[PDB]
């Protein structure tokens, strides 16, 4: 023998959707963080008045 082979190889990235399209769902989850609180804001002060 007298054999030394030490080797390397390269990676295959699984198609993780591979587009920005993920953002739109992320935009919906923005808005549900965003547009919800003022309901309570005006709710508690509607209840004050």
């Amino acid at each position: 023998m007298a054999e030394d082979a030490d080797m390397r190889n390269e990676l295959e990235e699984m198609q993780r959707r591979a587009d920005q399209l993920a953002d739109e769902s992320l935009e919906s989850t923005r808005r549900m963080l965003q547009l919800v609180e003022e309901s309570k804001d005006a709710g508690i002060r509607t209840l004050v008045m």
């Binding site: 198609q15 993780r16 959707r17 399209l21 993920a22 739109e24 769902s25 919906s28 989850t29 549900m32």
Partner: peptide, 15 residues
């Protein structure tokens, strides 16, 4: 691996 994203879009925009 995209239909659940479409639900993540759709069910949550519905929400």
């Amino acid at each position: 691996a995209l239909s659940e994203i479409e639900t993540r879009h759709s069910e949550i925009i519905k929400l």
